[PDB]
């Protein structure tokens, strides 16, 4: 009899502690669609091809709707689309925001606003000549824009300041400082959800809304405690707007970290046990440096998380059986994915880089990253089939678009850790649209079996309908 083997998500044993871990598809995304006896397939991540050369590795990106263009910070320079429109100091990741008048960048504990008229200003206190208040502005950690006001967060002191309405380079005249204060500490990040300023500390998330107060000195924001979320974020870039609220990576201040999404006053975990272990493998450092972001195309609603040694992509559109995570990597040896800071502009998705001063444009026809072939993996869960004598391992592979008749290394494991010999089977060939990728004589299952099915291509890989004849 025939048995259909799922490939979206495999099983295995982790030999560090002999545990049961999950095997996540590498460079593969699970697209749920009824093709033929399948109800879903797997497709290679779109390849990256060179678009622009810049000053350095990317450090931040935003979509300035005021100038309806993508602003990017590569190296020490600033770009509005392609042309350079400014210079930026420092070398780490920078925060970005924008308004009607300027594009603001948070860098080196400063809010530097590049106005569209060509003037570079910096947020600072009002001159003492004014009859206006003086605030204790510290180092800027994160910035956001709302209702024609920049709101920035003081460094590690719970306080956040909003700018003045008609002078954006200075804080508000009379009431610019606010606190979370339902907490001992934490202003790790700041964002804007719908009209609420959302302040992410460690072990709390606070919501503030416009008061409408008009008198001098009255508060222009009031906390709405009915919407407080009792969980924090690990670093300043460990949160992104995912579905209608934020998705964040929780802080060690509230137990073991994992990926959550704000519901309505509560957080619902998204990471499975294996993703939780992957996160737990990092210290508080190398976790506060993680960078989350989002992407959306062909109904794929991906949430991408870059850590020093991993890139985990969670597909929200194809999580009907549970959370669906995949691993993105560059090269043949689990080197970290090079693309970063994806933004959709015009009709193309453009991405920065991590190691070279380039910007690519995410071609869908290919799967090679800057003309470099990539390794694609697809593991099958272990199962117990004592004395089964399997035959006819078939996969329905979408062929036709290729530059060479690229092959596929098929292999099998018996204990979930070490895999056997690799057999090369032609999984694709140029300009042929009927291939029948198939291996006739698989072995005999003694106690357990699992399959590996690795592909190295410069061309897209589309696999579905994996089946075996178990007799």
């Amino acid at each position: 009899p025939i048995q259909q083997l799922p490939m979206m998500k495999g099983m295995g044993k982790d030999f560090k502690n002999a545990d049961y871990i999950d095997y996540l598809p590498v460079n593969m995304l699970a697209t749920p669609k009824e093709i033929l006896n399948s109800s879903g397939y797997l497709r290679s991540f779109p390849g990256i091809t060179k678009r622009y050369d810049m000053n350095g590795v990317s450090r931040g990106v935003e979509y300035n709707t005021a100038q309806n263009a993508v602003y990017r910070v590569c190296g020490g320079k600033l770009y509005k689309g392609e042309s350079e429109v400014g210079d930026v100091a420092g070398s780490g990741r920078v925060s970005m925001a924008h308004g009607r008048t300027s594009q603001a960048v948070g860098v080196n504990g400063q809010l530097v606003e590049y106005r569209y008229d060509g003037t570079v200003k910096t947020v600072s206190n009002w001159p003492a000549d004014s009859g206006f208040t003086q605030y204790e502005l510290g180092s800027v950690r994160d910035i956001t824009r709302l209702r024609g006001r920049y709101a920035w967060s003081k460094d590690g002191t719970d306080s956040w300041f909003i700018t003045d309405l008609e002078d954006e380079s200075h804080p508000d005249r009379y009431s610019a400082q606010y606190r979370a204060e339902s907490q001992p500490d934490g202003i790790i990040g700041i964002g804007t959800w719908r009209d609420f300023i959302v302040c992410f500390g460690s072990s709390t998330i606070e919501y503030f809304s416009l008061t409408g107060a008009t008198t001098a000195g009255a508060a222009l924001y009031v906390a709405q405690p009915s919407l407080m979320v009792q969980k924090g974020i690990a670093g300043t870039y460990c949160k992104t707007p995912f579905a209608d609220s934020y998705a964040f990576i929780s802080h060690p201040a509230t137990g073991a970290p994992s990926v959550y999404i704000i519901g309505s006053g509560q957080a619902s975990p998204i990471a499975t046990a294996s993703i939780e272990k992957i996160i737990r493998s990092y210290t508080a450092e190398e976790m506060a440096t993680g960078v989350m972001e989002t992407l959306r195309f062909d109904s794929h609603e991906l949430l991408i998380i870059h850590l020093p040694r991993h890139v985990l992509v969670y597909d929200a559109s194809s999580s009907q059986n549970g959370p669906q995570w995949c691993v993105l990597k560059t090269g043949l040896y689990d080197d970290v994915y090079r693309g970063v800071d994806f933004m959709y502009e015009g009709n193309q998705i453009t991405c920065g880089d991590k190691s070279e001063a380039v910007v690519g444009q995410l071609q869908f026809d290919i799967s090679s990253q800057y003309d470099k072939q990539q390794e694609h993996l697809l593991f099958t869960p272990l199962f117990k089939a004592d004395n089964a004598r399997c035959f006819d391992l078939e996969v329905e592979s979408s062929t036709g678009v290729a530059q060479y008749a690229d092959r596929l290394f098929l292999s099998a494991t018996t204990d979930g850790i070490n895999y056997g010999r690799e057999q090369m089977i032609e999984q694709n060939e140029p300009f042929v649209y009927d291939k029948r990728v198939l291996w006739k004589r698989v072995g005999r299952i003694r106690r357990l079996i699992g399959f590996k099915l690795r592909v190295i291509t410069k061309s897209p890989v589309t696999l579905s309908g994996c089946q075996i004849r178990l007799e």
């Binding site: 689990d334 895999y419 056997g420």
Partner: protein, 120 residues
């Protein structure tokens, strides 16, 4: 300047008294100049997978019909520390070979002391 020789991977262990592979043979790998049959004198032995991860395995390695090491009937690539001693035993317990130091079989024995004593 090609300094890497294209040779046979997956070494072959052959009978000492006849030209036949040591089918179902045993290899014990241990510390230098000591017998590796005793578990006290053994050293870790790893297998390198495709992904590069080294997984440690049980010490008596199995030699299949071809004279090459197998794990579960599958050819593997075995690795260990630079210096080790090998004791290859037959299926019935016969001693096929005993190499006290594997490093003392490289053709160029002079290079060892040369690279150890001459300054760079």
């Amino acid at each position: 300047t090609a300094n890497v020789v294209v040779s046979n991977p997956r070494p072959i262990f052959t009978e000492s008294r006849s030209f036949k592979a040591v089918a179902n043979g045993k290899i014990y790998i241990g510390q230098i100049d000591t017998d590796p049959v005793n578990p006290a004198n053994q050293i870790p032995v790893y297998i390198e997978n495709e992904d590069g991860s080294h997984v440690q395995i049980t010490q008596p390695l199995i030699i299949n019909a071809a004279g090459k090491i197998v794990y579960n009937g599958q050819l593997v690539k075995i690795v260990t520390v630079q210096g080790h001693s090998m004791a290859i035993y037959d299926a019935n317990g016969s001693q096929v070979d005993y190499i006290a130091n594997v490093l003392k079989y490289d053709p160029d024995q002079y290079s060892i002391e040369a690279d150890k004593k001459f300054k760079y």
